Amino acid sequence: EGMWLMQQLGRKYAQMKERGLKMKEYDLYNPNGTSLKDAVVLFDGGCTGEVVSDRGLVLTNHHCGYDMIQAHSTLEHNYLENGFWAMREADELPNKDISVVFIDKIEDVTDYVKKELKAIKDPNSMDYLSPKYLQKLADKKAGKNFSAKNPGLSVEIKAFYGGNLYLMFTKKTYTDVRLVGAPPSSIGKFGADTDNWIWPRHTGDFSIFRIYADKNGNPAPYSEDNVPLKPKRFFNISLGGVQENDYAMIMGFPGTTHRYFTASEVDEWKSIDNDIRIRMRDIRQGVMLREMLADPQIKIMYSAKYAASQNAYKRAIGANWAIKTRGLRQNKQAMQDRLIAWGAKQGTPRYEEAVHEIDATVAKRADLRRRYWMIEEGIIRGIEFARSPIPTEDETKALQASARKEAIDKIRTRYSKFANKDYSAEVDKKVAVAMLTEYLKEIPYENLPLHLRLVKDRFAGDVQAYVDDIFARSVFGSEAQFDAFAAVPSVEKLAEDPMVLFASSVFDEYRKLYNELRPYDDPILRAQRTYIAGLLEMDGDQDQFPDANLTLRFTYGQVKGYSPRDNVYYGHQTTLDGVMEKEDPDNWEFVVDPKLKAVYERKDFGRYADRSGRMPVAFCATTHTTGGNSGSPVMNANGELIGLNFDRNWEGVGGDIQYLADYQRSIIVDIRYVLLVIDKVGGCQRLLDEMNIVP
Amino acid sequence: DEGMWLMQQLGRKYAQMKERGLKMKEYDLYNPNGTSLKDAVVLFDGGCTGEVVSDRGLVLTNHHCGYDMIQAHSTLEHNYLENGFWAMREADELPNKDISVVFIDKIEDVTDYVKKELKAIKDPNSMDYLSPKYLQKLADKKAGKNFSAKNPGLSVEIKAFYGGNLYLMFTKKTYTDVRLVGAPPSSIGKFGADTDNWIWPRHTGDFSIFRIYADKNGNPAPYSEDNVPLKPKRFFNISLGGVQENDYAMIMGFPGTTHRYFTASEVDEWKSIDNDIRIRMRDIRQGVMLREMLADPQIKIMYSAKYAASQNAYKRAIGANWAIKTRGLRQNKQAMQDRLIAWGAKQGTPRYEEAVHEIDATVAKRADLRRRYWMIEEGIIRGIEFARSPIPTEDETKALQDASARKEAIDKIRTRYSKFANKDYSAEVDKKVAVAMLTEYLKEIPYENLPLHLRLVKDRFAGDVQAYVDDIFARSVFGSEAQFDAFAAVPSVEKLAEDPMVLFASSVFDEYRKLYNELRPYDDPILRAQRTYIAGLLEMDGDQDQFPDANLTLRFTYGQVKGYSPRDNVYYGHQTTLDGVMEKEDPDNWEFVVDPKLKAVYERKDFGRYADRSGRMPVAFCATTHTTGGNSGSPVMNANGELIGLNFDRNWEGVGGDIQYLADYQRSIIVDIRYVLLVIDKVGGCQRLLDEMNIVP
C-alpha cells in the first residue's frame, strides 16, 4: 500500500520480514554505509535504473532509453527497429544530455527547516514549498562551496507530508552514460500502444547503458578518455525466478500521488479533469480514426498524434473506473470525518477548518477549472491550428532597417514546423469542426476566446463556415497563401489574419484562466499542511505514506495475479508462448523478431526457462508504483534482481489516490527474459559475463 | 470426439458415465420399452430443444428460442419483448400460431430392414439410401396402412446415420397448441445481445416458458379454447443444489449438423474456400456498413440488424479458422484416414483407401467452381442488396406485352420494389457497399468467369466500378421512387429488358444458379465414398468412441462443469454470478441495460434458496459437454438427472468442435436453473410456476 521513505525502512522492517524479506536491514538501506540503495539511479530525470556490474552497466526500460536509441538510429543502422549490441566497450555510444543520479546520503532536516521558517513573518508565505528557498537552506547547511570541495556531489532539500517533514539529499550525478544494448522495438515495445496499461503483458521492455567517469570514478562529462565507473554497489542477478506469493520489493523514484485528496478533490478530479479529457479526446480520436482508416497516407501522418492522445485518455478511463467502482470518494470522506471527530474530541478545530478551506476553494474554482480543461483539451491540444504561428513583437516591429526578410524567414520556419510532413489541413479542419462544436455548446458566449464569438456574430452559428474561412483567408492556410504573403508582407495582414487571431485569442484565454486559477492552489496547499499534520498526529506515520515527489522510495508486496472481472483470473506470470499467440505479421505492433521466434521453436531457453520448461516473459506484483517507477529494480527476499518494473495495469491507475489491493499491480519484465534476449537475440555474451549471476 | 450419442448407445456408454459421476439408473434416463427422462425432452419449434418441467405440461426453452412468439404478442400497449411476460393464471397464457413441440415416443433400430429393402438396387450409384422420400416410403411400409389416422398425433420417420451404415425409425408425437407462459425482459433474456454472442464468461438469463395444451385425453390437438394442459408421461425435477467445479453434467437435445468424418482435404477446403472467402467478403461489407452507421444515426437504425446478421457467421468462421490453425484439425483428420488405410491394407481390402482417394479427387476437381460459388454468394448474393432487387417474371413480362393484366403486373412489381427499397434500405449505403464488394470480386474472378453484366465494368466503364454502380442507379427503374413511378406510368417490356439493375440482378443470379447446378453432382461421389469410409472406421475402431454425425435427432452428451484457459495467463472459471451482470451494466447501451427489479434483488441480496453456499447469486455455468446448433434450450442434468440448467450457447473457441471436439477449449454455455427460478420468482413474481415444478432441496 505505500511508497516509503528510506528513513521508514526501520519502522517497516519487521512487517517486511514477516512478509518474507530475508536480507538484513542495513544491507538494503544503511544511512551511514554502503547498501543496495547505492545501486539505484534516477535515469535521465524521469525513469529509474539499476547498476548490474562492477563496470557500471545499467539496466532500465526500453521506453526509458528510447530517445537515445532513436538519436543513434540512421537508415543504414536502424537500432530502433533492429536492436543494438555493442560487442566491445569502445563501441558503446555516448549520449548528449543524459544523466544518472545516485542518492549518496539522505538526512532528516525537519527541525532545521522549521526553525529557519520561523523567521518568515507572513503566515501565508509559500517559501516552505519553494525550491529556491529550500535550495538556499540546503546550500547553507552543506556549506559555501560544497560542490567544489566534493566534486560530482550536490544537495537538495524537499518537503514531504505537505510541509511537515523535510529531507536533504546528497546526490552524485554522472553525465557520460553510454548506450550498450537494446532489443529490437518488436521486443522492447511488443504491445506498442495496444498493450499500454495492460496485464497480461508480453513486452521485453529493457535497454542497457553504462556509466562512464574519470580515472578516479568521479563524475565527468563525455570525454574519449573516460573509463567505466566501478560502483560501490551493484545488483546480483537471480536465475531462481519467481513463484506465486513470492516476496518482491522495488526501489525507485515515483513522481506524484494524491493520497491526501479530500472527497471534494476526488469529485473535482472525476467531474472536471477526467470527464472533460475523456469527452474531448473521444471526439478528437474518433475524427482522427475515421480519417486514418480512409487514407493510408493519413494513417502514417497521424499515428503518433493519435497514440499520444490515447495514452492519458486510457489513464482517465481507468481512474474514473476506480472512482465509480472502488469507493475512492467515500474512503476520502471517511478519512476526513474520522479526523474531524478526533479533533472535536481534543478541542482542536483547525483540522475541520482545514478540510472546509479545501472544500470551499474547490467549490469556488469550479467554473474557472471547467473553462480551463475545456479550452486545454478542446483547443490547445485538440486543434493543431491553435499552435499555428503568432508573429512575435520582434517580428511585427521589423515588418513595420530592412530585416523584413529576417522576420519572414523566422515566420516561414515556424510555418514549416506547423505545416510539416505529418500535417493535414483537411484532417485538422474536420477535427476543429467537431471539437469547436462541443466547445461552443459548453462555453457560453461571454466566456469564449474573443475570436470564437465570430461563430455566432459573423457566421450565423456555422462552425464549418468559420473554420473554412480561417483556412481560405489565412496566410498559414496553405503554402501558396504563405508565399503570397511572404512576397508582399504587411503587419496589417498579420493583425487581421483569421488564423493568427484565432491562435492568439485561444492562447490569451488559456493564459488568463491559468493566471486566475493559480492563486487557488496556495490555500489548498496551506490547508493540506494542517490536514496531513492532523492525520499523522492521529493515526501515525506508520500506514500513511508521504505523497510521491520524485524522491527515492521503496515498496514491497508479492508476485500475485488478480481477478479483473467476474469469472476471469489473470495469473502472476506470462510466457514466450503468449508472445507467439499475439503474433500478427501484418500489424507492426505485434510482429515477432525472427531470431526470438526461432528460439521459441527450438526451445533454446538454456538456464532461463522455468522448472516446467516454459520461458517466462513478465510477472506482476502487489507493489505500489506510479510514473517515475519505469525501470525500477525488482528484488527477491534476498535483494537479488528478479525483474524491472515497466508499467502498471489500468485498473490500478486510481492507486495514486487510493491503493487497490485486489486490482493494482506493477507490470514487470522477468530478468530471465532480459538475459534470454541479450544472450540468444543480441548474442552479447560479454554483458552476461560481467554481471554476477546467482544460480 | 467427446460425442453426441444415440439413445441406443446409452447401454454401452453407461459404465463410463457411472465412473464419471452418473448416479441414476440406466433405464430411468432412457428405456426403449418404457417411461424415462428422454420422454421429458422435446424438439421445440423445429430447431430448438425444450423440456417438460411439471405434471401440467410446463416447458422451458431459451429466450432466443421463444423470441418470435414473445415478439408476435408484443404491442406498444403491452411490450412483452422489452418488459417480460408473466401469465398469472393458465387462462392468460397466450396461444401461438405455427408452433410445435415434438416428443420422441419410440426409437427403433431398422438397419437390417432398410439394408434388405435397399438390396432391390437398380443402380449401385443410387442415392435412395439417403433420400427422405424413399426412407419415408419405408417408414410408412413398416408403420402400416393409414398410421396417422389410426394413431392421431403420432408420425413415423426413418433417418440414416454414419453415412448410411445405420438407420433409426422414430415415432414422434407432435403438439401444436403450445402457449406462451412466461419470459424475462429482453434485458435479462438477451443481456449480452450480439456483443456477447459465442462468448464465455456469459451473464445472459436466456430462458422462456411455454405450456403444452392438448384435448381431454392428452392427445395432440390444434388450438381450441376447450384445450386443457397436457399431463405428461415424464417431467424434470428442478435441483436447487447447484453446481461445483468438476461436477458431472449431461445434456439431451437435437444437435443439427457436425462434420466429424471430414477428410483432411475437406478441412483444407473448408478453411481456404468457405471460411477465408466468408471472412474476407464479410470484413469488406461490415467495414463499409460500420463507417456509414457511425456517421449517420439514421443509417445505424436502418442497418443494425443487417450488420448483426452478417457478423454472426463471420465470427463463427473466425473461430473455426482459429481451430484449424492452432488445434491440428487437418492433421488429426489425416491421421484418422492414414490409420484406416494402413488397417485396410492388412485386411486385404483396398476399398477404404479407394474411398478416401475418391473424396480427395472430388474435392480437388471442384475447387475452382466452389471458389467461384462462395465468391459470388458472399460477395454479391449476400453482399449487395441490389442483387435482390426485382426481376420481372416470365408471366409479368408476358402480361406487359394488351389487357388489364398490365396494372396487375405493375402492382406486383411495385410490391416487390417496396420490399427491396423498404424503410431500412439506403441506396447510398448500398452503392458504397457494392463498390467495395465488386472491387474485391472483380480482382478474384476473371472476365471469362464473370456474370455477363459485370463484363461491362471493363468493356463499357473502363474499369471504373464506381461509374458502373452509379449508372445502375441513375438509369434503373428501381434506382429511386421517382424512377419507378415514371416507369409504372408508361411501362414497356423493352425498358425492363434493358434495365441495368434488372440485367445485373438477373446476370448474378444466373451465374449463382449455374455454379450451384454444376457443383451439385460432386456431392454424390463424396457421400457414397463416406458410406464406405465410415463403415471402415466403425469396423476398425468400433461404434464406441466414434459418434454418428448430428442430423437433428435426439442425442445425449456428458461431461463436467469446468472452465478453461483461453490464452497465456488467463483463466475463465466454470461459473458466472449476478455480480458479473452488474459489472457489465451500461445504461446508455441497450445491450447492457439492467432490469431495475433485478438490480434491486442484487442490492438487497434477496436471493433466497437460489444463492450458492457463499451467498453469491449464480447466473451461468459452462461444461465439457459436446453441443452444436440445435442444442439451444437443452436440459442440463445433474448426476441424478435433475435439471441444473439450460444450454443456450457455445464459446467461439469451440466452434471447430463440429469437426473435432476440443477438450481444452470447447464448452457449452448454460443458464443456471437457480438464476431461472430467481427471475421467475423475484422479477416475474410468478409463484404458480414455482409451485407446479417439483423442486428438490
Ligand SMILES: Cc1cccc(NC(=O)CN2CCOCC2)c1C
Ligand atoms: C483504460 C483503457 C481505456 C480505453 C481503452 C484501453 N485499451 C483497450 O481497451 C485495448 N486493449 C487491447 C485490445 O482491446 C482490448 C484491450 C484501456 C486500457
Ligand SMILES: Cc1cccc(NC(=O)CN2CCOCC2)c1C
Ligand atoms: C470469434 C470472434 C471473432 C470476432 C469477434 C468476436 N467477438 C467479439 O470480439 C465481440 N465482443 C467485443 C467486446 O466484448 C467481448 C466480445 C468473436 C467471438
Ligand SMILES: [Cl-]
Ligand atoms: Cl557509486
Ligand SMILES: [Cl-]
Ligand atoms: Cl475391398
Ligand SMILES: [Cl-]
Ligand atoms: Cl483442445
